């Protein structure tokens, strides 16, 4: 079986689909990882390329290259699982318990050899995936870290947002790496702009998505897109990308450069947890939700 609460969906460059799920109810509170080289057949357990069971639930994951999978676990662990060379098995590479609470967010840095993890233990940690050790451990926030997101091009730059209403830009080259980018509502999701290395977007718990230029600490634009917490933001692979927003209001939205809505979907019956764009068809957007649905949308 596959745990009902589908938590993460990520498209690989070659077209395969990675699924991370967790059992948030029932007897066992574990999790699982799955790889479908046929993404239309998901989430059928007999129609997958590979699958493995973790000990605890998967709170977040991300690809690490073409065969690596970095998992933030409920157990307080960060675990790297490497795919098979035949791509038929998912075998654990390391599983280090370094956080004193649930690891809720992970992000691979631009070099692809280091990662950033955030947890409900209020700390953020930098990981060297090769030496399987923690390089640095920062405690800049005052509440649980909701999201971390590595900059796509700068290896020492990443964003964090926590329930202390702080959004922090991090350049680990400075003696004080964190810088506060401003109090309204708590930030929940962070998404760098894929082209402009100094622009990002953040969603808040109130359903608003805002676009921020890091040069000037002021919201260039914002829009109330959802009625509930914005849980994720993913940009499309287009030359001029579209912005996919998922929320706890069970709806998916696709906005443009000026945050104007072009697509709206209510195909999900529970929380929408992750969205990923097809690298083979840029108009295809695959979303997953706690209703165990894997929906493939055709965005105009």
């Amino acid at each position: 079986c596959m745990e009902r609460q589908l938590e993460a969906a990520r498209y690989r460059s070659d077209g395969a689909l990675l699924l991370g799920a967790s059992s948030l109810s029932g007897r066992c509170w574990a999790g699982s990882l799955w790889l479908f080289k046929d993404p239309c057949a998901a989430p059928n357990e007999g129609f997958c390329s590979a699958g493995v069971q973790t000990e605890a639930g998967v709170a977040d994951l991300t690809w690490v290259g073409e065969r690596g999978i970095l998992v933030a676990s409920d157990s307080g662990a960060v675990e790297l699982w490497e795919l098979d060379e035949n791509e038929t098995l998912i075998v654990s590479k390391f599983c280090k318990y370094e956080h004193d609470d649930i690891v809720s967010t992970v992000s691979v840095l631009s070099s692809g050899t280091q990662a950033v993890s955030g947890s409900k233990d209020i700390c953020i940690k930098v990981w060297d995936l090769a030496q399987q050790v923690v390089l640095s451990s920062y405690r800049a926030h005052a509440a649980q870290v909701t999201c971390v997101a590595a900059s796509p091009h700068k290896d020492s730059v990443f964003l964090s947002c926590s329930e202390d209403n702080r959004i922090l830009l991090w350049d680990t080259r400075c003696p004080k790496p964190a810088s506060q980018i401003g109090p309204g509502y708590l930030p929940t999701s962070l998404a760098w702009h894929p082209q402009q290395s100094e622009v990002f977007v953040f969603g808040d718990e109130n359903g608003t998505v805002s676009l921020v230029d890091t040069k000037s600490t002021s919201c260039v634009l914002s829009s109330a897109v959802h009625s509930q917490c914005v849980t994720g933001l993913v940009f499309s692979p287009h030359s001029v990308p579209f912005l996919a927003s998922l929320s706890e209001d069970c709806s998916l939205a696709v906005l443009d450069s000026s945050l104007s809505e072009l697509f709206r979907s209510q195909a999900h019956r529970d929380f929408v947890r992750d969205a990923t764009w097809s690298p083979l068809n840029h108009s295809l957007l695959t979303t997953v939700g706690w209703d165990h649905q894997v929906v493939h949308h055709v965005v105009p």
């Binding site: 609460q5 967790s22 948030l24 109810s25 029932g26 007897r27 066992c28 509170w29 574990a30 000990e55 605890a56 639930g57 709170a59 676990s73 409920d74 157990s75 307080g76 318990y97 370094e98 956080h99 004193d100 609470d101 649930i102 409900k120 233990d121 209020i122 920062y138 405690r139 800049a140 926030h141 005052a142 509440a143 649980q144 202390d164 922090l168 400075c174 004080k176 790496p177 964190a178 810088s179 506060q180 509502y185 718990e205 109130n206 009625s227 509930q228 917490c229 706890e248 209001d249 069970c250 999900h268 019956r269 529970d270 929380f271 706690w290």
Partner: protein, 625 residues
């Protein structure tokens, strides 16, 4: 032994996890009853109608296991004091749901966090849950010594940490607690789970907490140092705090992951047990008093009622008190008659209040010790004890001792005494009417006569204790004033309290009273400098007494007689707690009042704010003459 639990936020299999943590040696497990990441919608569709089950089944454990081994933890996403109305409503519904499920499981305790200043709606929901249904679960408010905002690393360039010191600011967490329990009206089911950080705060912050109802102390694994062999240890100051908590008999909760990954996880608990075994050994007083900690005892009547046989039996076994009395009598006999008179002079001793005759035998031993002659009278108003006295006088004492079944105020003495000896002192010295009795008796003391005790003095000290305030509040009884329990003193081995200022003398009495207008009514004003922020709930009372010259007894803490268990401190509560700031002065006033029939105390606080005059005209507490 240490009652210790393991805190966890990830439980895949409750059977496996409980078995593992029990094999590690823990006594209970703090876990979530719902998956902490499993947020639930209650208002708007479609997430409103998410098919169940909502959590794991109660059948996975037995009723006894649920009742003794599981502590519930409120889900972290539940924020009733959020500023988003949707989140507020969903958190209210989910908090009620999780508390009701904890009550359904019969959980002994449930954990809720205090991690911000405003927890008003959290307190509203918790109070409504407490006043709904019939459940007996404790509620542990998880509150840190230092708030996480004041613990964060100084790594934010454009938002540095204020390196300047704020006295009340570094106390803010206590206020978080104080307001919360104030909104819940001092519910006896709402206790503190104090969480200790890597860096302890200054001493005053830690001083605030030790008068509060702390039921658990939470020790993260990140605060444990590493010794030479690799085992997790604590700093010396952390060890001091752990010792203080062990005196309070709190339960110790180990949270976080295993950071000493060469050793197993039971090493932290092993170090805790090591500290517990190597604690300072208790003295004789702490052994005699074990079991009476913070147990309130209502006022008795030393003259209206008679003491039971077991009471004499237990209070007869105080060797320090009676050895001091024997030394006093011995020194007095030596100073009252020279050696050239040791055979020509017989001294008239009168034990005014002999009981079963411990002071009679003390006088006999003091005479055999000073090699002087004595003539003994043993006066006792309790006839049941007069039976014991007369049987002893027939079997042992003989002609020397004359047993007098009478009140000393009523007894027409056949002759006058050289020495009168008594032990009529209560916890507040004169609260058992020793002045009135000795005044009624001093007319048959020789003009050069000696009274033992020679004098006595009472002492008062303002205290802070939510525990004892709640204990007094719980003494409300039907068919009397709903606030009469606050207008009477209690005898209690004070324990979970905070002494706010040094004890200062209140009332003093001397015997014989060499004044023509003998008046035992008193009015006294005491000013107590307070050098912390605190909440005043009452006044502890002690006493000292001069038996003879340098021979003394004392329950005053600074001069306490070693190993003397006969007297516990007294407690004068106040109806309403009074907030005191740093540097403010607590000004209190005490009256000793009396008429022909009874004696009572009246007391009122006049600074920093006025209280009501407590026990006016003795309407709630009197001592029958």
């Amino acid at each position: 032994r240490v009652s210790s639990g393991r805190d966890l936020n990830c439980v895949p299999e409750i059977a496996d996890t409980l078995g593992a943590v029990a094999k590690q040696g823990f006594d209970f497990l703090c876990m979530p009853v719902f998956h902490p990441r499993f947020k639930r919608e209650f208002i708007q569709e479609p997430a409103k109608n998410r098919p169940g089950p909502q959590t794991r089944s109660d059948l996975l454990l037995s009723g006894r296991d649920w009742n003794t081994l599981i502590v519930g933890k409120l889900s972290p996403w539940i924020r009733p004091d959020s500023k988003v109305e949707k989140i507020r409503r969903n958190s209210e519904a989910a908090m009620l749901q999780e508390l009701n499920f904890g009550a359904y499981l019969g959980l002994p305790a449930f954990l809720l966090p205090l991690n911000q200043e405003d927890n008003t709606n959290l307190a509203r929901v918790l109070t409504n849950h407490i006043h709904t249904g019939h459940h007996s679960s404790m509620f542990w408010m998880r509150v840190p010594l230092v708030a996480p905002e004041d613990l964060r690393d100084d790594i934010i360039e454009n938002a540095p940490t204020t390196h300047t010191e704020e006295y009340s600011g570094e106390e803010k967490t206590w206020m978080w607690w104080h307001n919360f329990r104030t909104l819940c009206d001092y519910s006896k089911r709402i206790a503190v789970a104090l969480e200790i950080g890597a860096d302890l705060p200054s001493n005053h912050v830690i001083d605030r907490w030790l008068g509060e109802p702390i039921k658990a102390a939470i020790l993260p694994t990140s605060i444990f140092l590493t010794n030479k062999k690799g085992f997790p240890v604590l700093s010396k100051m952390h060890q001091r705090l752990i010792f203080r908590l062990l005196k309070l008999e709190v339960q110790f909760i180990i949270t976080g992951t295993n950071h000493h990954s060469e050793k197993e996880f039971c090493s932290y608990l092993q170090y805790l047990e090591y500290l517990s075994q190597n604690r300072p050994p208790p003295n004789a007083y702490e052994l005699f008093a074990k079991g009476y900690e913070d147990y309130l005892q209502s006022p008795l009547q030393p003259l209206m009622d008679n003491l039971e046989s077991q009471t004499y039996e237990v209070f007869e076994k105080d060797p320090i008190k009676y050895s001091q009395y024997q030394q006093a009598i011995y020194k007095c006999l030596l100073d009252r008659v020279p050696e050239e008179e040791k055979d020509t002079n017989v001294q008239v001793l009168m034990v005014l209040g002999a009981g079963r005759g411990p002071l009679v035998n003390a006088s006999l031993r003091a005479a055999k010790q000073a090699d002087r002659r004595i003539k003994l009278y043993a006066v006792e108003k309790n006839p049941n004890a007069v039976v014991t006295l007369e049987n002893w006088q027939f079997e042992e004492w003989g002609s020397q001792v004359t047993v007098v079944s009478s009140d000393m105020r009523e007894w027409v003495a056949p002759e006058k005494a050289d020495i009168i000896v008594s032990e009529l002192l209560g916890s507040f010295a004169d609260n058992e009417l020793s002045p009135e009795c000795l005044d009624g008796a001093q007319h048959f003391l020789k003009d050069d006569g000696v009274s033992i005790p020679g004098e006595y003095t009472s002492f008062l000290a303002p205290i802070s204790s939510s525990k004892l305030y709640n204990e007094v509040r719980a003494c409300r009884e039907k068919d009397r004033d709903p606030e009469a329990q606050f207008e009477m003193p209690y005898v209690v081995r004070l324990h979970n309290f905070h002494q706010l200022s040094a004890p200062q003398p209140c009332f003093t009495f001397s015997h014989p009273n060499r004044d023509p207008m003998i008046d035992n009514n008193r009015y006294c004003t005491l000013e107590f400098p307070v050098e912390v922020n605190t909440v005043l709930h009452g006044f502890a009372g002690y006493f000292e007494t001069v038996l003879y010259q340098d021979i003394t007894l004392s329950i005053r803490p600074e001069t306490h007689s070693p190993g003397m268990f006969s007297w516990f401190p007294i407690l004068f509560p106040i109806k309403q707690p009074i907030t005191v700031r740093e540097g403010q002065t607590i000004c209190v006033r005490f009256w000793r009042c009396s008429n022909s029939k009874k004696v009572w105390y009246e007391w009122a606080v006049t600074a920093p704010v006025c209280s009501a005059i407590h026990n006016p005209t003795g309407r709630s507490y009197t001592i029958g003459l």
